[PDB]
Amino acid sequence: TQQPIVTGTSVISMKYDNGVIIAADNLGSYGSLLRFNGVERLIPVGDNTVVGISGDISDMQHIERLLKDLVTENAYDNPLADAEEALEPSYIFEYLATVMYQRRSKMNPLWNAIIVAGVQSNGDQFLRYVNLLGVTYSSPTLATGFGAHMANPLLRKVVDRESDIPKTTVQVAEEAIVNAMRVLYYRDARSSRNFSLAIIDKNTGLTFKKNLQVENMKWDFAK
Amino acid sequence: TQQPIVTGTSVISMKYDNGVIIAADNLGSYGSLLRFNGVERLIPVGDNTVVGISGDISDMQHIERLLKDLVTENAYDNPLADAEEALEPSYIFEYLATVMYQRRSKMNPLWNAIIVAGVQSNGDQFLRYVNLLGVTYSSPTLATGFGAHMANPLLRKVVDRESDIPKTTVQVAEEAIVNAMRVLYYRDARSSRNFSLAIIDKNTGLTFKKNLQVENMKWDFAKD
Amino acid sequence: QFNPYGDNGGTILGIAGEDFAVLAGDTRNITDYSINSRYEPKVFDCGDNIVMSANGFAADGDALVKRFKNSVKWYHFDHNDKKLSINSAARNIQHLLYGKRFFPYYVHTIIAGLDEDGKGAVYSFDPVGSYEREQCRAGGAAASLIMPFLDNQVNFKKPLKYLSVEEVIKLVRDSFTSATERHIQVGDGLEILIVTKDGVRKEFYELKRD
Amino acid sequence: DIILGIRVQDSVILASSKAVTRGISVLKDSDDKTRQLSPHTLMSFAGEAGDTVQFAEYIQANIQLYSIREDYELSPQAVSSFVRQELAKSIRSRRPYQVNVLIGGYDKKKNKPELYQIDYLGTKVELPYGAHGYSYTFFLLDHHYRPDMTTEEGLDLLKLCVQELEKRMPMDFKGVIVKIVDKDGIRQVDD
Amino acid sequence: DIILGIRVQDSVILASSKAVTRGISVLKDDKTRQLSPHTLMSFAGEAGDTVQFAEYIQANIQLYSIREDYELSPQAVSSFVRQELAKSIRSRRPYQVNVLIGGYDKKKNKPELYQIDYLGTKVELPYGAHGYSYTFFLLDHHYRPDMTTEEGLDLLKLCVQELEKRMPMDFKGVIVKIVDKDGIRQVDDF
Amino acid sequence: MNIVPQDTFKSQVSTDQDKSVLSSAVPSLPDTLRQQEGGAVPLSTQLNDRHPLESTLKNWETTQRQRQMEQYRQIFGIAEPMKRTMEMEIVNRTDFNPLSTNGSIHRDILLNKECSIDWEDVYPGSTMVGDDVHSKIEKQLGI
Amino acid sequence: LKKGEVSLGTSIMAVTFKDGVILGADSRTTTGAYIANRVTDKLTRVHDKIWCCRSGSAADTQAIADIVQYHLELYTSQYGTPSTETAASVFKELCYENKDNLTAGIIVAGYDDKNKGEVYTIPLGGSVHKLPYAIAGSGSTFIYGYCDKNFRENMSKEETVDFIKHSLSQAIKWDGSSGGVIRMVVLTAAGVERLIFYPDEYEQL
Amino acid sequence: LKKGEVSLGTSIMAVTFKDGVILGADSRTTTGAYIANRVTDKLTRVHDKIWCCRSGSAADTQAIADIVQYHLELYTSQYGTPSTETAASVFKELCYENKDNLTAGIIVAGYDDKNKGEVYTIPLGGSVHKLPYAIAGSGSTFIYGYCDKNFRENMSKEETVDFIKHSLSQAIKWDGSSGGVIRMVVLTAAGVERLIFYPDEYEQL
Amino acid sequence: AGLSFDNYQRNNFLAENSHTQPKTTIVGVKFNNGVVIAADTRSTQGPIVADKNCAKLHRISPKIWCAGAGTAADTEAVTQLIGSNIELHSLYTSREPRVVSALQMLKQHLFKYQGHIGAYLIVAGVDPTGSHLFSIHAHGSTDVGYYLSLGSGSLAAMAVLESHWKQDLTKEEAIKLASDAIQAGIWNDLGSGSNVDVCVMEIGKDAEYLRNYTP
Amino acid sequence: SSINGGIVVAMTGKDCVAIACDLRLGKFEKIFHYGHVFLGITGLATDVTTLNEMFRYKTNLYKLKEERAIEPETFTQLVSSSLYERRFGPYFVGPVVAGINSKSGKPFIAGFDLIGCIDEAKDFIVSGTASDQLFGMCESLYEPNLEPEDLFETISQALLNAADRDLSGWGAVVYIIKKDEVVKRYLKM
């Protein structure tokens, strides 16, 4: 589009020793009106990849259609679609980044910011970011929008460099992600209390948690 | 001010054989929001004058304060300011028109349209109009805003010339003004179903009816 | 109106030696006040002993490097796996840049390698394709801090010809350390690619802010 | 760019100035504001750089093609009408460019000289006089013109116009090239 | 409006264009005012404001000369002019004005030339000019501090010949005045 | 009851609006030499291109004091503003110090600015004409 | 939004209930402050039991609705009665693919024997959302709270009628661009029912 | 508003009840999408039993409120406890006379022995309106209908508290500039009572 | 008198004719018996680091301190003017200055200039009435907070403060929390760096100014 | 007649300072002194002359009242307040103050923005149009605690290198300032 209308706020993601964790809230805001509650902004693509999208919701649904078409075309007509011929996170990100840059060059961008998180077939963690301009980068911690200014400084406390990844368990990473989501719900006016989270682990696979709520909120210091 | 914020829609008035009639609806709207309902936009100044104001509501209240100040100043050390030294519609209109033009020339106008209606002490009808630019004029029927485009055609069929005035009774004029108010409620989006009406007669003297509702509305043909 | 450009704020440096070339860059990717990543390489091995860097708007630089690598692949396919020389690569990059004359890439490009005589060579490109061969070229933010530091310790007119590769690496590291100290956009790491007759070698050095 | 045209009893006289494009020191001996359309039809042009020369050469090529095809020379009236059509067609789908054209010919069939002026929008006017560029000369031409003037008198009138114009030019007015079109063809005046 | 000035070893030579006034046909030196018996001022710029400023300066300097029975130095006159010019535009949109001040200091027995631009920047110069689109090449090549008055006039004549080659015939000419130990003279014949 | 100063622009202009510097030769025209403004400052140039905050800053204290006087009149009566204005007028009238511009102690006591500092105090804010005691004497006495 | 065009300032509601769905709207069309049409039928039928209401540009939504009705006639000629989801998908595709040139918003209500009554909303931009109830238009902003406090799942027909009547009466009361009569269409298995309510009835609620 | 100034995107309510008046608000201050203050006290005390809430420019409203409190202290030193009408008149005069330079809107709630609790509203522009109850702010637009359906005269204290809680909870739910806790002040003949309700309370209503 | 408007037209004219006119993390945290203010020490003239050790904590009065962002000259001038006024008022009243008095002076001064003085401040202090923390905006609006952040690195600092703040904090806990917020601003924001400066104001004690608390 | 812009560099030594400015060779110098305090101003020339005159005025009055010369820190505060007085009409200048305190003997340098914000440096100050290239040269060449001869060589080399990298009649004026002796030198390139 040329201007977003219905939007989502932020997606935050982190690497730990055996996988990745990604999270995003369930809200589509219509300007300053919190219009739609119940928007799933984490899209699982297969059993090894999750894509988080922020920004325009219609463009996000278009991207979801593209991902579904990609999955369906993977199985046409390989009988090993569930086997070693399954889609890798790098393939999905390469396709999405090419689309985003091509549409930027067409002066008709998809007003979104996208994080791809997953585990490669050899067990490596994949975490990448691409926006409406086609700018791509990777880091042990990633965030979009307000999270990029608030959630990232918290998560970089846990994982500050690549050598901290093997030292970080899934429990610590999930706790950090949940605390960052609570901070975002504290200080973001377009945020929601309800959010979804996804863990991708090279051993246990994909765990997708829905209807997660921010809890243990300190409001008692009124006076 | 520089831009109106809360506004009223329209005031309609006409002369009949023995007096004047003026009416306006009770609504103060905030943009497209119909925010304030119980707003009185007809102000009686003395026993023989009514001022109807449309437009900015804050400026209307300022004008109400000015009218009250004028009434109190008239009675200052004036034992005769009840019958002989009372205010007249021409005095009030001249003062208001002077104020409006002076504030136009100051590039700080009062965003209002004003109709003064009443009866002079000699029995003559008075009905005149002044707006935010200081433009003044008189006619046997007057209206502001949307009424000026819709109420005037209905009213000019009853009183078309100066010679039609002696032929118009109070009943006919009041019925015509009620019908014009109903048409305005039909076709004005910023209008209200509630309105106030004022009759100034050289014999009875004044009749200020409040809480009048548009009645007898044809909506049934919407079945088709 | 939609603005298709951006700025990511890097710093690159290319130096041509007697029988080697060096291309180095800082590894921090930022969006105008925030750190997107502390390790994001911008100097790439393109094959046939050619190293390339396109600093500026990151999407444009990635696109240019992608197109150049694909063109080199087709060049190997169509010419019996012939080695692409550095001057031919410079001409290819000039055409790639000028092909977008009316919608230019927002990048500054430097390539490095060895010429047909085995001597080090560095080429610098303007955003619409104008290019030239240079001994030393600094590009991006803090170039005005890096060039005087190099000129203070090298006579480009110890002469640069007789310098060894390790001395050049140390001098580049010192200049980048000083620039990191004085500039807010420089830091978090430095990556150096060295091209010699044996190929391309990679070195990494941590800078301030971790 | 200044162009002048004067039609007399037996010929047409056209005067044109040099270019001096933009701060470029050029020493040359040629007329870049005149194209010979046919042995008895000449064209002078003044306007925006690039576009005007392209248009003039396109017109010249078309007229040369007609002359080769028919083994016959178009009259000045037909040439001027074709030029007007092409000029109106050029700006059909683009922003108009500044151009003014003087066409001077000698109709052999009618045995008489003719002069036309076409402006940038495509307005063609048959005139005994004509000028474009610097903006008084109309008053002097109206005061000192006769339809039955000879060539010498026309040249003297042109010299008077040049002398009047030179006193307002910023002293960079070099030699104005003057050409004559008549029954013997086209020639250039040395003076 | 073009003004020129050259300082030779014992004199100051100031040249000013005769007259250009919009599109009025006039026949008739309006761009010079004698500030002091040994100090002359040439100005060029916007019509109206510049003449007001020059006459104001002249009135002030004449008042000083009357009050003190003494002639203010060229340096002090230049400083006063700079102060007044800076003060005039402190609360209004600036106007185009350029001033050359030429004098002969009696105490030091030396010619002096100053140039002041529209913002109030004063510079002491051996030669100066304003209003021409340069001529500084000829001045740089053909100027020496120890030149006599005749050599300065020759250099000025060469500069004027250079000027009157890309200007129309509407450029009537230039009036030349000389300030030296005897006061102010007008170069009539030459 | 104003807060920001209002009605600051001039509604009319004239060439003799400044009665202090009127020319003796032509009384309807101002005297440019004794103005000492630079000699090239028409009055019309002062009607355009001003800073939007200059008028607010110049008239701020007067506006606040007028609001205070209006409040006193509303709450106390006419006598309170009458007395405050009378005191201020008496203090201002009986001070004539041509060699200094600093305000008096008593004025600051009446204005409740005994221990208050503003940029006007920090920055209180050469010529051949009209920089003498006699000009101030004439202005003060209306000679 | 092109200058001089006609905009659909309205109050639109669609509520799912126990036996089916109900779609309701007001009947006012305004150009500026002038009521250009005092009596308007805003309930557009694209199939026998698939209805819609429109917002945004009137011309764009009319063209889109015509194309959708044509598409559903082709589908019916081939495969029979479509589902509400199919009509919603066609509406979404039309609105999204042209969003750079047209300003359209749609509320779709439908009934079929499989899904048993559904509501979809496509706001400006082209995204689609499926909801148990939906409100749209300029006058909807004033009843976001009230509806959120008074909606129950599996209400009876009369309760749904009363809920829609109350909510639209409040929206009419507060929004200038809304007024006139209330129109409602009830889509169930028993057929299609039409209801109209007059100002003298709902203004007393 | 001025460029870079701080705006007041609040949700303000004031309800008259049998024993007096209750004034309530949320506690969010924003700078666009960023919440600069999770817990701000929007209930301004102008006198002992005369309180107000503000909207528009924050600096202008603070200056106006300070001047009004100064005015009421001056009035009290002379004649004693002022009526709510007098405070409303002073607010109105300040807002109207400066409306060309200051953006300000006020809701005034007061109690006094003569009038037994009153509510006045002064929207942008400077007009004054005396109401049985008032709502203002960005979130108020979403609860115009609900309040109109749920207000009764002469309610008890608990009923009024519940009504304000429900209305402000909906306003917080729908408006993005309305925030965490609900603060209320009850003004009666007994005194001044302060109440606060937390999100875990009202979000489950 | 006061700030001058001379050469405004001249400067605008120069700007129109192509003449270029030549041209931080702060936190405040209250604890159980006082208040702490902390700041980074990096001073940059654009992207160039002008000074690696810059003192940004300024003293309104011995026990009332402040830090600022925005236009540096405006911040310093307003702080110094209000400090002079506070000192004179304290001498006049023979009493310790109150933080609310400084808040009123700053608010009225900034409102007088209608936002043209670009001073954004955090002001902390202790007086005989207790401990106080305030934020002050350029246009004249003020707010009260238990913990506040300011500058370009204010979002990271606010995240850290929201993570680890409680009602009852000791002096050491508050100092550590403020230092951690400043460190987050230093690491994650390009405008903040170098060292941390702290000032602790405790009820009943002298103000403790710790420059380069963590280097 | 065009003298706008320029470059001024100030450096601290062991117990000395150096302040240098560009020049056009061949009377308009951008360095002034008011006793033992030196001020170099870059930018608009009219503002430079005005500021020099104002500061000569104020320091003459200060010495007449105090009966002693003004110290570099007090002069820095004075320059700051004077620049801030013109808050909305500021001079288009960058000033630099250098000197040695008469009592303590400590060297002092500082720079200013156009409205008087003070930047007190311990190593060097660069003012000028570019302030990015000569800044890098000074950063590469500067070393702390240099002797006056070493400091003079360093600052002169910085000026020469700046002059070479982007003319014809370029010159420089250098001041080497000690507690008892001040040396003024010209560089003709």
PDB file of C-alpha atoms in Angstrom, chain B residues 109-213:
ATOM      1  CA  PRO B 109     -14.773  38.603  14.151  1.00  0.00           C
ATOM      2  CA  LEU B 110     -17.631  37.069  16.110  1.00  0.00           C
ATOM      3  CA  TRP B 111     -18.582  34.018  14.021  1.00  0.00           C
ATOM      4  CA  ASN B 112     -22.346  34.459  14.247  1.00  0.00           C
ATOM      5  CA  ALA B 113     -25.433  35.312  12.236  1.00  0.00           C
ATOM      6  CA  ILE B 114     -27.964  37.378  14.174  1.00  0.00           C
ATOM      7  CA  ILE B 115     -31.625  38.253  13.615  1.00  0.00           C
ATOM      8  CA  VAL B 116     -33.295  40.946  15.730  1.00  0.00           C
ATOM      9  CA  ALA B 117     -37.097  40.810  15.868  1.00  0.00           C
ATOM     10  CA  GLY B 118     -39.569  42.915  17.793  1.00  0.00           C
ATOM     11  CA  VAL B 119     -42.152  45.684  17.824  1.00  0.00           C
ATOM     12  CA  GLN B 120     -41.344  49.376  18.192  1.00  0.00           C
ATOM     13  CA  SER B 121     -43.151  51.528  20.746  1.00  0.00           C
ATOM     14  CA  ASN B 122     -45.266  53.046  17.945  1.00  0.00           C
ATOM     15  CA  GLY B 123     -46.500  49.615  16.804  1.00  0.00           C
ATOM     16  CA  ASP B 124     -44.149  49.073  13.856  1.00  0.00           C
ATOM     17  CA  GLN B 125     -42.595  45.666  13.278  1.00  0.00           C
ATOM     18  CA  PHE B 126     -38.801  45.380  13.316  1.00  0.00           C
ATOM     19  CA  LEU B 127     -36.887  42.511  11.708  1.00  0.00           C
ATOM     20  CA  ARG B 128     -33.249  42.834  10.665  1.00  0.00           C
ATOM     21  CA  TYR B 129     -30.185  40.660  10.061  1.00  0.00           C
ATOM     22  CA  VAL B 130     -26.449  41.131  10.695  1.00  0.00           C
ATOM     23  CA  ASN B 131     -23.614  38.623  10.189  1.00  0.00           C
ATOM     24  CA  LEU B 132     -19.924  38.257  11.077  1.00  0.00           C
ATOM     25  CA  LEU B 133     -18.843  40.631   8.283  1.00  0.00           C
ATOM     26  CA  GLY B 134     -21.126  43.421   9.499  1.00  0.00           C
ATOM     27  CA  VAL B 135     -23.533  42.983   6.576  1.00  0.00           C
ATOM     28  CA  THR B 136     -27.041  44.094   7.555  1.00  0.00           C
ATOM     29  CA  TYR B 137     -30.349  43.877   5.733  1.00  0.00           C
ATOM     30  CA  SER B 138     -34.102  43.749   6.271  1.00  0.00           C
ATOM     31  CA  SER B 139     -36.937  41.822   4.617  1.00  0.00           C
ATOM     32  CA  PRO B 140     -40.438  40.585   5.581  1.00  0.00           C
ATOM     33  CA  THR B 141     -38.899  37.109   6.068  1.00  0.00           C
ATOM     34  CA  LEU B 142     -35.372  36.333   7.267  1.00  0.00           C
ATOM     35  CA  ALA B 143     -33.343  33.175   7.837  1.00  0.00           C
ATOM     36  CA  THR B 144     -29.742  32.090   8.375  1.00  0.00           C
ATOM     37  CA  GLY B 145     -27.724  29.141   7.125  1.00  0.00           C
ATOM     38  CA  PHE B 146     -29.657  26.264   5.581  1.00  0.00           C
ATOM     39  CA  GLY B 147     -32.920  28.018   6.421  1.00  0.00           C
ATOM     40  CA  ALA B 148     -31.848  30.870   4.151  1.00  0.00           C
ATOM     41  CA  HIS B 149     -31.960  28.372   1.276  1.00  0.00           C
ATOM     42  CA  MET B 150     -35.037  26.358   2.290  1.00  0.00           C
ATOM     43  CA  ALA B 151     -37.170  28.237   4.820  1.00  0.00           C
ATOM     44  CA  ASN B 152     -37.267  31.498   2.857  1.00  0.00           C
ATOM     45  CA  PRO B 153     -38.937  29.922  -0.233  1.00  0.00           C
ATOM     46  CA  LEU B 154     -41.669  28.508   2.012  1.00  0.00           C
ATOM     47  CA  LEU B 155     -42.103  31.786   3.905  1.00  0.00           C
ATOM     48  CA  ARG B 156     -42.064  34.056   0.839  1.00  0.00           C
ATOM     49  CA  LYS B 157     -45.137  32.237  -0.488  1.00  0.00           C
ATOM     50  CA  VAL B 158     -47.093  33.544   2.519  1.00  0.00           C
ATOM     51  CA  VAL B 159     -45.560  37.040   2.697  1.00  0.00           C
ATOM     52  CA  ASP B 160     -44.254  37.889  -0.773  1.00  0.00           C
ATOM     53  CA  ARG B 161     -44.352  41.709  -0.623  1.00  0.00           C
ATOM     54  CA  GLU B 162     -44.771  44.535   1.867  1.00  0.00           C
ATOM     55  CA  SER B 163     -48.491  44.561   0.992  1.00  0.00           C
ATOM     56  CA  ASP B 164     -48.920  40.908   2.013  1.00  0.00           C
ATOM     57  CA  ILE B 165     -48.120  41.780   5.642  1.00  0.00           C
ATOM     58  CA  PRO B 166     -51.573  43.206   6.578  1.00  0.00           C
ATOM     59  CA  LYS B 167     -53.226  40.072   5.137  1.00  0.00           C
ATOM     60  CA  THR B 168     -51.328  37.525   7.279  1.00  0.00           C
ATOM     61  CA  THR B 169     -52.786  36.419  10.600  1.00  0.00           C
ATOM     62  CA  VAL B 170     -50.768  35.015  13.492  1.00  0.00           C
ATOM     63  CA  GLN B 171     -52.125  31.497  12.922  1.00  0.00           C
ATOM     64  CA  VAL B 172     -51.018  31.385   9.280  1.00  0.00           C
ATOM     65  CA  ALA B 173     -47.547  32.755  10.046  1.00  0.00           C
ATOM     66  CA  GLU B 174     -47.004  30.343  12.934  1.00  0.00           C
ATOM     67  CA  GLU B 175     -48.142  27.391  10.820  1.00  0.00           C
ATOM     68  CA  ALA B 176     -45.779  28.416   8.015  1.00  0.00           C
ATOM     69  CA  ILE B 177     -42.839  28.706  10.412  1.00  0.00           C
ATOM     70  CA  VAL B 178     -43.647  25.321  11.985  1.00  0.00           C
ATOM     71  CA  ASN B 179     -43.717  23.736   8.520  1.00  0.00           C
ATOM     72  CA  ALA B 180     -40.382  25.359   7.670  1.00  0.00           C
ATOM     73  CA  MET B 181     -38.876  23.968  10.885  1.00  0.00           C
ATOM     74  CA  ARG B 182     -40.166  20.500   9.978  1.00  0.00           C
ATOM     75  CA  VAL B 183     -38.619  20.752   6.504  1.00  0.00           C
ATOM     76  CA  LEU B 184     -35.318  21.827   8.071  1.00  0.00           C
ATOM     77  CA  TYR B 185     -35.397  18.829  10.409  1.00  0.00           C
ATOM     78  CA  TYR B 186     -36.024  16.664   7.336  1.00  0.00           C
ATOM     79  CA  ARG B 187     -33.141  18.002   5.261  1.00  0.00           C
ATOM     80  CA  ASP B 188     -30.559  19.384   7.736  1.00  0.00           C
ATOM     81  CA  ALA B 189     -28.088  16.902   9.222  1.00  0.00           C
ATOM     82  CA  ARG B 190     -26.981  19.315  11.975  1.00  0.00           C
ATOM     83  CA  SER B 191     -30.577  20.042  13.020  1.00  0.00           C
ATOM     84  CA  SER B 192     -32.693  18.946  15.982  1.00  0.00           C
ATOM     85  CA  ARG B 193     -36.289  17.890  16.545  1.00  0.00           C
ATOM     86  CA  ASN B 194     -36.623  20.323  19.475  1.00  0.00           C
ATOM     87  CA  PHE B 195     -37.010  24.053  18.917  1.00  0.00           C
ATOM     88  CA  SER B 196     -38.037  27.279  20.627  1.00  0.00           C
ATOM     89  CA  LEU B 197     -40.524  29.775  19.191  1.00  0.00           C
ATOM     90  CA  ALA B 198     -41.248  33.397  20.084  1.00  0.00           C
ATOM     91  CA  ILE B 199     -44.204  35.587  19.116  1.00  0.00           C
ATOM     92  CA  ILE B 200     -43.981  39.353  19.614  1.00  0.00           C
ATOM     93  CA  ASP B 201     -47.374  41.030  19.181  1.00  0.00           C
ATOM     94  CA  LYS B 202     -48.243  44.686  19.710  1.00  0.00           C
ATOM     95  CA  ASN B 203     -51.389  43.657  21.636  1.00  0.00           C
ATOM     96  CA  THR B 204     -50.605  40.499  23.632  1.00  0.00           C
ATOM     97  CA  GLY B 205     -46.963  41.511  23.988  1.00  0.00           C
ATOM     98  CA  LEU B 206     -44.782  38.383  24.092  1.00  0.00           C
ATOM     99  CA  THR B 207     -45.180  34.605  24.021  1.00  0.00           C
ATOM    100  CA  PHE B 208     -42.075  32.441  24.436  1.00  0.00           C
ATOM    101  CA  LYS B 209     -42.843  28.775  23.765  1.00  0.00           C
ATOM    102  CA  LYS B 210     -40.127  26.256  24.613  1.00  0.00           C
ATOM    103  CA  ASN B 211     -39.867  22.487  24.136  1.00  0.00           C
ATOM    104  CA  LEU B 212     -41.643  22.377  20.775  1.00  0.00           C
ATOM    105  CA  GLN B 213     -41.166  19.202  18.743  1.00  0.00           C
TER     106      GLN B 213
END
